[PDB]
Ligand binder design. Structure first.
Ligand SMILES: CCCCCCCCCCCCCCCCCC(=O)OC[C@H](COP(=O)([O-])OCC(O)COP(=O)([O-])OC[C@@H](COC(=O)CCCCCCCCCCCCCCCCC)OC(=O)CCCCCCCCCCCCCCCCC)OC(=O)CCCCCCCCCCCCCCCCC
Ligand SMILES: CCCCCCCCCCCCCCCCCC(=O)OC[C@H](COP(=O)([O-])OCC[N+](C)(C)C)OC(=O)CCCCCCCCCCCCCCCCC
Ligand SMILES: CCCCCCCCCCCCCCCCCC(=O)OC[C@H](COP(=O)([O-])OCC[N+](C)(C)C)OC(=O)CCCCCCCCCCCCCCCCC
Ligand SMILES: CCCCCCCCCCCCCCCCCC(=O)OC[C@H](COP(=O)(O)OCCN)OC(=O)CCCCCCCCCCCCCCCCC
Ligand SMILES: CCCCCCCCCCCCCC(=O)SCCNC(=O)CCNC(=O)[C@@H](O)C(C)(C)COP(=O)(O)O
Ligand code: SF4
Ligand code: SF4
Ligand code: SF4
Lengths: 55, 156, 43, 114, 318, 176, 82, 115, 185
């Protein structure tokens, strides 16, 4: 992303595609390494009534 | 003395030439060959360390046993090892090449390639990461760096 | 509840087709450039 | 007691197949010592072939000796073609193994196995 | 003082091979989105020294089944013919100024095949023999056009003299009148030197290493440096043929710097073709140089015979 | 719902025949491939400078084993052998007895790191979070039996890497 | 192939190159199994030594019927002229 | 004289880079390292068996087109003659005869390989 | 060793041969030097070499024998050769040309100081000269391999295994039934 515009233009000419829109090197746009604590949902049988195992 | 300095600098020269020009042979066996290929991949890049593939055993330095050594390919591993010039080294990659691994109690698994070849570095994992395999290669380079061939020869 | 979910409007468009964008000159222009180089070299 | 055969209808055809297999191994052994460049004599390999055939000289069931002939010809196919190596041929010579104690007294001395 | 001249020819073109190994691995690295060697020296500048010292201290391993006289005599001839094809090359003044230096280059191209050939035969192995006869299947394909292309490019020169090939191109580059011969000569020098897409002798994936699959280190270095000496020599020969520079008779350094950067661009082009293409099946090689390049080469040979007669542009032989 | 790869008949007008013949004689696609290789030449390569830069990992990562302790000094392993019962390689070997203050604790707790398959069944079967599979992966050995960990080496790995294992479990435990 | 006497003496030469048979009891009318004390495979390798010396392939059903060297020399007389 | 000095120098430090390659390192020779290499296992028979050439008609025809570039080679010199129509006619006749030979080897399927 | 350890088991091998020996490999690696020089054509000294697996079995069966404490063993082969027909048999198993010549005292002790001039391993030395031409003594009073229950293996079973390494290529694939054995004394 720090490639100068002469090398950036030569590189786009040599590939034939627009390369800065689709860079295979990852930058600030990817997810944060430290994520907030989650709250996972419980299944359908987490009930206190009408929840017999035989049914 | 003077000659101790001479053989010490010659040992440092040949240990440098052998640790910074390790040529591993193209030898995979199992899942660990994928992660050995990722140790050759452009993220980790073995080739910057002087570590480049040579397909024949005659033209290679270290044999990375990467995968499971069965009973059917144990003599093939040994004859590949024998057809390496000296100095030859072995890096054991993965649990099956270390000690039998996940197939340890099998009828057709050589329980570790240390039954077959002399093993220098044991790289643990199932598979070890390509970062851990590159760690094992750099520890092999540290083991080559502290060799004392000509110092022992001048002292013998 | 907090869970790894896609956003409200969904993710953006993701291209998946062959995109080979047909660059270069045509045939006659390349033959003309080559034969012009031949004629300049011969002269 | 009516079973289905494999190749042999009785013991005579079965012994014929064992005899042809012994002929084939006896022809094969000098080439086996030669091309594998083994460190034994040709007579020693022929003795090992004799021992491996006399190991199974007690069977009176035609299907079992037919399967032994089939397995022996598979061994011979892996020998004529170089599919086995020096190691797979020399596994018939139990050389690195120590000779086991055979009498009662030394088995009593060294271990618990009867 | 001529021995000093021979040594100042042949030692820097071994060090150019040595640092070409670093250039090869780093340009092949960055073209493959990785890095090359950059750890051993400052950005890799000492990696060839370790790669050179390592091979001459590793065990030499003469095999059992090998014909040992030919097995040792083949890399000696390989490195000898790697060195002796530099001596008529005008830089702008060659070491050995030959009247017939082009045919000297062609004859020592033909004789260099026996290095690979006797090395693959003498090392009594099977992949070595397969590579040694794929060397024949490649050589009978490239030599049967390597002479006619080089013949037709000298019909505008006047003689087989490499030094006159600078005077010939004083007005125009010789790639302008003979660009089909140039773009066919470049492929014939690719196929000549066993460089990709024409590896086919040291074919890493068909064979193991092919003709030198038995050569362990020490005798193996004299094929590696021979191959790289042949590619540097051959790009210099292609530069002299088709991209000849300005020669000041009072300042030879202008010509030397100019054809140095041109031959470096051609060697980088070799490494850049090696980093981009699959490899031929060696019948498709033979169905290329015989069925595609040879008829068009004969046509261009007729053209470059009859064209100086047509335009009264027959060059002098003096 | 299906498509035909390579079912394009090439056009047979003089324009496209001349284009294909100039492609044959002037090598258009070979220059296209060289252009793409040259386009990767001028890029910043993806080579991280190991060992000074490390590849990215998650707090779920499964590396070297370690026995944790409670925040009182008492070790968490109460000798229940779920980890060796679930261990698909049988790398774990446990033997126990009541110690001097009557607590159910282990005497032998061995993990063969050359049988271990690093699949983390022991850390997800352990009901007290005693055995965990920590974040270290650069623990290569020059000798085979140095990868045969007994209880003391696993407790030292716990006391070595606890300041990181506690934070990985703190960031991860809500997914479990 | 020339004489019957040379073929009989050549059978005796084969069986005196053979190492298990007692040369003292070895006669033309001596039986292999119940007199010379031979295993069946010993008689089979006798037949293969006859194939090595005489130079013609001997099948199975007519080599199992060869229990003395007189039967051997008669079978060699049957497959040739003499 | 200078050419022979140059060839002797190149041959000399070709064979001085071989005798410092055999006599410098430490050798541990045993009769499995010097065995033939056939990818881990033993070679099924020797490599001195007939390795059959399929490109053999093209290999003969290399010898009959290699004489053509012994005939067609003085064309940079033969253009300097004072009989130029005859020289041009014989030159284009020799390249045409080479082309007729190559066309006959084309149409009779000789450049194709066997099997 | 005897006077500081009273129960020392001292073992006397005569001439040990194996894959990495310096007895048969000493004989086989003198071919390009000029024709294997000897004193009086090497027919005045008598040897009986012993095989290394028999030596090893004797050492370990002396480890496991309590009756070998204080004893002194002499591990010798089953057959005694001269030196000349031994070198005959070595070059005949290796399928090598054999052109001997006698070399007396006058300069064959000086090829010692001719061939340790470098600080490497000397290829031959004058002590090795004095020991190759020294006959093996026969000590009937000392016990040997057969007194430990170790069968002494002759040279005609293992010389092919030692000396197949030195055959060039034109007689590598040969047989053990090629060489007529060396005459005993
Ligand atoms: C070929 C002729 C020289 C080309 C010079 C060159 O490559 O300039 C880079 C420059 C920018 O390259 P880029 O690919 O966009 O990389 C951006 C950097 O990553 C952005 O720069 P950076 O943030 O990486 O800055 C650090 C870098 C900055 O880079 C430099 O200072 C490059 C110096 C090259 C000389 O400096 C270093 O890494 C220290 C020097 C190490 C390389 C030394 C090379 C010596 C070569 C001669 C011996 O290239 C150009 O401007 C185009 C080529 C100019 C050619 C001029 C005509 C000849
Ligand atoms: C063109 C590029 C290459 C240039 C030439 C190479 C550059 C470096 C040159 C000097 C390298 C050191 C000598 C060769 C390597 C020896 C390594 C070795 O195994 O040493 C142990 C060997 C042997 O030591 P040893 O007695 O321990 O033997 C070990 C082997 N066993 C146990 C089986 C017996 O040492 C030598 O042979 C000494 C070599 C001479 C020391 C250097 C002299 C000056 C050379 C200049
Ligand atoms: C020396 C400096 C550089 C020189 C330039 C070269 C740089 C670029 C290099 C690119 C990398 C190439 C790597 C190796 C590739 C090997 C494969 C390959 O290309 O094979 C060759 C390919 C082979 O094509 P193919 O493989 O498709 O073969 C077709 C075969 N059939 C049909 C049976 C399926 O092309 C050629 O043979 C072309 C040769 C050169 C053509 C030159 C023509 C000049 C113009 C003539 C006149 C035309 C008009 C008519 C007259 C008009 C008169 C007014
Ligand atoms: C035609 C041109 C041809 C050019 C060929 C060569 C191209 C590359 C040139 C070299 C480029 C720079 C290389 C620098 C390498 C690193 C040097 C260095 O610092 O080495 C450190 C090493 C250990 O030092 P130490 O004191 O132990 O450090 C502990 C500190 N607490 O200390 C040592 O290793 C000891 C010192 C070694 C120094 C070696 C330097 C490189 C020499 C290369 C040979 C060529 C020299 C020039 C030839 C051409 C000009 C005449
Ligand atoms: C190098 C060494 C290579 C080793 C080769 C191993 C091959 C082993 C093949 C084993 C196949 C057999 O054992 S087949 C034998 C089974 N036959 C029987 O049980 C019937 C009894 N057979 C016999 O007694 C045989 O001796 C005869 C000759 C068939 C009959 O003799 P009778 O008379 O008494
Ligand atoms: S140690 Fe495990 S993951 Fe690695 S190669 Fe073996 S089976 Fe595959
Ligand atoms: S990670 Fe898997 S293989 Fe390793 S000890 Fe735990 S359960 Fe066993
Ligand atoms: S480590 Fe956990 S699962 Fe294993 S015995 Fe101890 S408490 Fe139980």
């Amino acid at each position: 992303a720090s490639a100068t515009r002469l090398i950036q233009g030569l590189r786009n000419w040599a590939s034939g595609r627009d390369l800065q829109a689709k860079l295979q090197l990852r930058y600030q746009e990817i997810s944060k390494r430290t994520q907030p604590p989650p709250k996972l949902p419980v299944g359908p049988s987490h009930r206190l009534s009408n929840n017999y195992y035989c049914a | 003395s003077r000659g101790e300095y001479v053989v010490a600098k010659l040992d440092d020269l040949i240990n440098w030439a052998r640790r910074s020009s390790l040529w591993p042979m193209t030898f995979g066996l199992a899942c660990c060959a994928v992660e050995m290929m990722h140790m050759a991949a452009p993220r980790y890049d073995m080739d910057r360390f002087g570590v480049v593939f040579r397909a024949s055993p005659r033209q290679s330095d270290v044999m990375i046993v990467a995968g499971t050594l069965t009973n059917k390919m144990a003599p093939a591993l040994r004859k590949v090892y024998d057809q390496m010039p000296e100095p030859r080294y072995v890096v054991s990659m993965g649990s099956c090449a270390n000690g039998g691994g996940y197939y340890h109690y099998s009828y057709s698994v050589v329980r570790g390639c240390d039954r077959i070849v002399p093993v220098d570095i044991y790289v643990p994992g199932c598979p070890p990461t390509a970062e851990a395999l590159l760690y094992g290669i750099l520890q092999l380079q540290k083991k080559i760096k502290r060799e004392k061939r000509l110092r022992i020869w001048y002292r013998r | 509840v907090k869970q790894d979910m896609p956003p409200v409007g969904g993710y953006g468009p993701i291209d998946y087709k062959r995109n080979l964008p047909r660059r270069g000159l045509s045939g006659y222009s390349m033959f003309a450039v080559g034969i012009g180089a031949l004629l300049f070299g011969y002269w | 007691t009516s079973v289905k055969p494999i190749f042999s209808r009785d013991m005579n055809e079965a012994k014929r197949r064992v005899r042809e297999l012994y002929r084939a191994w006896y022809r094969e052994v000098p080439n086996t010592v030669h091309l594998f460049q083994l460190d034994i004599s040709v007579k020693q390999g022929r003795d090992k072939v004799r021992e491996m055939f006399k190991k199974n000289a007690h069977v009176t069931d035609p299907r079992v000796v037919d399967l032994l002939v089939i397995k022996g010809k598979m061994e011979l196919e892996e020998t004529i073609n170089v599919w086995k190596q020096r190691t797979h041929v020399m596994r018939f010579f139990h050389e690195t193994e120590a000779p086991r104690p055979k009498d009662f007294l030394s088995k009593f001395y060294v271990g618990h196995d009867p | 003082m001529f021995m000093i001249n021979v040594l100042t020819l042949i030692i820097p073109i071994l060090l150019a091979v040595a640092f070409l190994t670093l250039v090869e691995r780093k340009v092949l690295g960055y073209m493959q989105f990785r890095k090359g060697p950059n750890v051993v020296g400052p950005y890799g500048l000492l990696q060839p020294i370790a790669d050179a010292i390592k091979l001459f201290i590793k065990e030499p391993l003469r095999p059992a089944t090998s014909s040992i006289s030919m097995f040792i005599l083949a890399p000696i001839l390989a490195l000898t013919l790697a060195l002796t094809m530099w001596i008529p090359l005008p830089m702008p003044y060659p070491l050995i100024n030959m009247n017939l230096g082009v045919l000297f280059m062609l004859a020592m191209s033909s004789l260099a095949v026996y290095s690979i050939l006797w090395s693959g035969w003498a090392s009594n192995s099977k992949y070595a023999l397969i590579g040694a006869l794929r060397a024949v299947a490649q050589t009978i394909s490239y030599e049967v056009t390597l002479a006619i292309i080089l013949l037709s490019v000298l019909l505008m020169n006047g003689s087989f003299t490499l030094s006159t090939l600078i005077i010939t191109q004083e007005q125009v580059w010789l790639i302008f009148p003979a660009w089909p011969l140039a773009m066919m000569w470049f492929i014939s020098t690719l196929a000549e030197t066993n460089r990709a897409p024409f590896d086919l002798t040291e074919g890493e994936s068909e064979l193991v290493s092919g003709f030198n699959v038995e050569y362990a280190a020490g005798p193996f270095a004299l094929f590696f440096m021979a191959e790289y000496a042949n590619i540097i020599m051959m790009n210099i020969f292609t530069t002299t043929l088709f991209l000849g520079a300005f020669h000041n008779p009072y300042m030879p350094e202008l010509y030397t710097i100019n054809f140095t950067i041109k031959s470096l661009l051609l060697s980088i082009t070799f490494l850049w073709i090696r980093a981009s293409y699959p490899r031929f099946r060696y019948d498709q090689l033979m169905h290329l140089l015989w069925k595609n390049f040879l008829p068009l080469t004969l046509a261009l040979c007729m053209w470059h015979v009859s064209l100086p007669i047509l335009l009264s542009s027959i060059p002098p032989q003096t | 719902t299906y498509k035909y790869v390579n079912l394009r008949e090439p056009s047979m007008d003089m324009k496209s025949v001349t284009d294909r013949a100039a492609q044959t004689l002037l090598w258009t696609e070979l220059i296209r491939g060289l252009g793409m290789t040259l386009s990767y030449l001028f890029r910043e390569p993806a080579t991280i400078n190991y060992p000074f830069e490390k590849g990215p990992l998650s707090p779920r990562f499964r590396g070297e084993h370690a026995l944790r302790r409670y925040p009182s000094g008492e070790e968490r392993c109460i000798a229940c052998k779920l980890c060796e019962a679930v261990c698909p390689a049988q790398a774990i070997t446990i033997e126990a007895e009541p110690r001097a203050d009557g607590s159910r604790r282990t005497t032998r707790y061995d993990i063969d790191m050359t049988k271990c398959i690093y699949c983390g069944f022991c850390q997800e079967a352990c009901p007290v979070d005693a055995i965990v599979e920590g974040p270290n992966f650069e623990f290569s050995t020059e000798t085979h039996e140095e990868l045969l960990y007994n209880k003391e080496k696993l407790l030292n790995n716990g006391d070595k890497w606890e300041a990181e294992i506690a934070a990985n479990i703190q960031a991860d435990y809500l997914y479990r | 192939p020339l004489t019957l006497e040379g073929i009989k003496d050549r059978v005796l030469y084969v069986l005196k190159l053979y190492d298990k048979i007692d040369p003292e009891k070895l006669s033309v009318n001596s039986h292999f199994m119940k007199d010379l004390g031979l295993d069946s495979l010993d008689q089979v390798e006798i037949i293969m030594a006859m194939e090595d010396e005489f130079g013609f392939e001997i099948p199975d059903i007519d080599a199992e019927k060869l229990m003395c060297p007189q039967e051997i020399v008669d079978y060699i007389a049957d497959k040739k002229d003499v | 004289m200078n050419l022979m000095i140059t060839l002797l120098t190149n041959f000399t430090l070709a064979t001085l880079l071989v005798t410092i390659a055999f006599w410098l390192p430490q050798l541990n020779v045993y009769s499995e390292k010097t065995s033939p290499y056939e990818c881990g296992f033993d070679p099924m028979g020797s490599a001195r068996l007939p390795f059959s050439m399929k490109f053999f008609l093209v290999a003969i025809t290399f010898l009959l087109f290699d004489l053509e570039i012994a005939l067609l080679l003085p064309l940079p010199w033969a253009s300097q003659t004072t009989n130029l129509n005859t020289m041009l006619t014989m030159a284009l006749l020799l390249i045409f005869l080479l082309a007729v030979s190559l066309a006959y080897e084309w149409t009779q399927k000789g450049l194709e390989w066997t099997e | 060793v005897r006077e500081t350890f009273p129960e020392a088991t001292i073992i006397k091998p005569a001439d040990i041969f194996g894959r990495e020996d310096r007895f048969l490999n000493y004989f086989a690696n003198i071919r390009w030097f000029g024709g294997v020089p000897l004193i009086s054509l090497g027919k005045k000294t008598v040897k009986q070499p012993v095989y290394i697996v028999d030596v090893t079995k004797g050492i370990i069966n002396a480890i496991k024998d309590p009756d070998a404490r204080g004893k002194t063993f002499a591990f010798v082969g089953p057959n005694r050769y001269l030196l000349f027909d031994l070198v005959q048999y070595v070059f005949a198993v290796a399928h090598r040309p054999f052109l001997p010549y006698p070399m007396p005292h006058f300069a064959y002790r000086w090829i010692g100081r001719l061939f340790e001039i470098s600080p490497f391993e000397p290829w031959t030395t004058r002590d090795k000269v004095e020991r190759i031409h020294t006959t093996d003594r026969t000590l009937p009073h000392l016990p040997g391999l057969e007194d430990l229950g170790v069968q002494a293996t002759p040279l005609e079973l293992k010389a092919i295994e030692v000396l197949r390494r030195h055959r060039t290529y034109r007689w590598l694939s040969s047989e053990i039934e090629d060489v007529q054995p060396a005459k005993t004394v």
